[PDB]
Amino acid sequence: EAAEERRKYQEAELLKHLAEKREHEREVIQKAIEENNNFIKMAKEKLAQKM
């Protein structure tokens, strides 16, 4: 049982590492969304101001 528990601890560390990967994946794509939207908003505001 102590060896079984050691296997379980190591799997849990693993799934926790992969969970950190999934949140980084989420941060990357929401960063891309945020920057495309800020480009569009910036361009819209500069155009309005210059017109």
């Binding site: 060896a3 079984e4 528990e5 296997r7 190591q10």
Partner: protein, 439 residues
């Protein structure tokens, strides 16, 4: 009559177990459907062959045997083989995925899952025994199952059958016969874990069997079948005394009494002769003196080593065929004056001799020719420690770099168990040196 249960674990133990029971049936005149015309007590009896076979009302003689492998492909060749009818389903036990050459996976990860089942099926055989002597366990040192699961089973057998004897037939790894690169690890791990649970262990080195197959059968590249049929001959020589009338090694306790003065030094060397090619038309029949002399030739030993550079604790000569005591003692007297045969000082310099008049049986169509006499010598000599030193050295090379260790720790094994195991083998090597060498 007292019963013996045979247990075959992993690929090597199962495939060797197949060969032995095939041989046992031939030796006893038991047909592949389990019928035995010679047996006139239908559905019962306490003859000597009943130590290894029980009987059904239908007259079928059933091996007191269990086959266990964590993968189904090898045992499936028993289910569908030539003796399908001999065994019943409950005796063949297969898991789903094997131990991947990994002692820790066979012992901890998969072993946990399957041990209770295996023990339950063995219990069904023990319940049919009026007076169980104990177990004969066939396995490789090197496989993940043969090493890892065998050691777990032997521990649990000492629990559930504390008063029973346990004998091993262990296949010692040799690169000539496909080995995993981690077999040194597995070998040391399982010897450490099994040492105090086994009463007597016969090591068979695949290198020795392989070379005998090349040299004496002139098979250029021997198969597992070639290897296992020779091994089964030697096994049958060792177990004959349990299955036939006689007065030497008639129960498992006598093996320990006659071969093992010191419980840890319980690995007798087996030497077998003669091994004769069956495609060799006309061959002179070797005499008692010659086959007995061949028992002191390292080329005939089950483990290659040099008994001249060690000391004997015990020696049994097991003859099959046309042999009388007169010829044995003549041959022994001659051999004592020409060979280098040193016993330890605290032990009698002598030989226990057993003769069964029936000459060895060979498998029809096999590569071994019938002979009119053969002998298996079982000697407890310190020279077998050379096999431990060799294995221990390979273990050290790899462990110094922790090579492959992560496979074992990943299955829940602590690195410390490697050091535990290796230190036990170090004591073992020094026990042998104390007993058999002088400064």
């Amino acid at each position: 009559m007292r019963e013996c249960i045979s247990i075959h674990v992993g690929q090597a133990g199962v495939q060797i177990g197949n060969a032995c029971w095939e041989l046992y049936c031939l030796e006893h005149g038991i047909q592949p459907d389990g019928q035995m015309p010679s047996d006139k007590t239908i559905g019962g009896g306490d003859d000597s062959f009943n130590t290894f076979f029980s009987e059904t009302g239908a007259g079928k003689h059933v091996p007191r045997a269990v086959f266990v492998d964590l993968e189904p492909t090898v045992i499936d060749e028993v289910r569908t083989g030539t003796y399908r009818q001999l065994f019943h389903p409950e005796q063949l036990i297969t898991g789903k995925e094997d131990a991947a050459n990994n002692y820790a996976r066979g012992h901890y990860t998969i072993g946990k899952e399957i041990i209770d089942l295996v023990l339950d099926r063995i219990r069904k055989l023990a319940d049919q025994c009026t007076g169980l002597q104990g177990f004969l366990v066939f396995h490789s040192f090197g496989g993940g199952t043969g090493s890892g699961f065998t050691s777990l089973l032997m521990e649990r057998l000492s629990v559930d059958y504390g008063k029973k004897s346990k004998l091993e037939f262990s296949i010692y790894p040799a690169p000539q016969v496909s080995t995993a690169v981690v077999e040194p690890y597995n070998s040391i791990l399982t010897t450490h874990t099994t040492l105090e649970h086994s009463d007597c262990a016969f090591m068979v080195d695949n290198e020795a069997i392989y070379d005998i197959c090349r040299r004496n059968l002139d098979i250029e590249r021997p198969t597992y079948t070639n290897l296992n049929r020779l091994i089964s001959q030697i096994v049958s020589s060792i177990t004959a005394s349990l299955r036939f009338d006689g007065a030497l090694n008639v129960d498992l306790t006598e093996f320990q009494t006659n071969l093992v003065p010191y419980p840890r030094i319980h690995f007798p060397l087996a030497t077998y002769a003669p091994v004769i090619s069956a495609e060799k038309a006309y061959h002179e029949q070797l005499s008692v003196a010659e086959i007995t002399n061949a028992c002191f030739e390292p080329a005939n030993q089950m483990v290659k080593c040099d008994p001249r550079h060690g000391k004997y604790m015990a020696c049994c000569l097991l003859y099959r065929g046309d042999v009388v005591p007169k010829d044995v003692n003549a041959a022994i007297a001659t051999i004592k004056t020409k060979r280098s045969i040193q016993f330890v000082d605290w032990c009698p310099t002598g030989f226990k001799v057993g003769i069964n008049y029936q000459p060895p049986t060979v498998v029809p169509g096999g590569d071994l020719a019938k002979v009119q006499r053969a002998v298996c010598m079982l000697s407890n000599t310190t020279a077998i420690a050379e096999a431990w030193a060799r294995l221990d050295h390979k273990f050290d090379l790899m462990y110094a770099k922790r090579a492959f260790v992560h496979w074992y720790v990943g299955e829940g094994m602590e690195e410390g168990e490697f050091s535990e195991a290796r230190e036990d083998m170090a004591a073992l090597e020094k026990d042998y040196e104390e007993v058999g060498v002088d400064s």
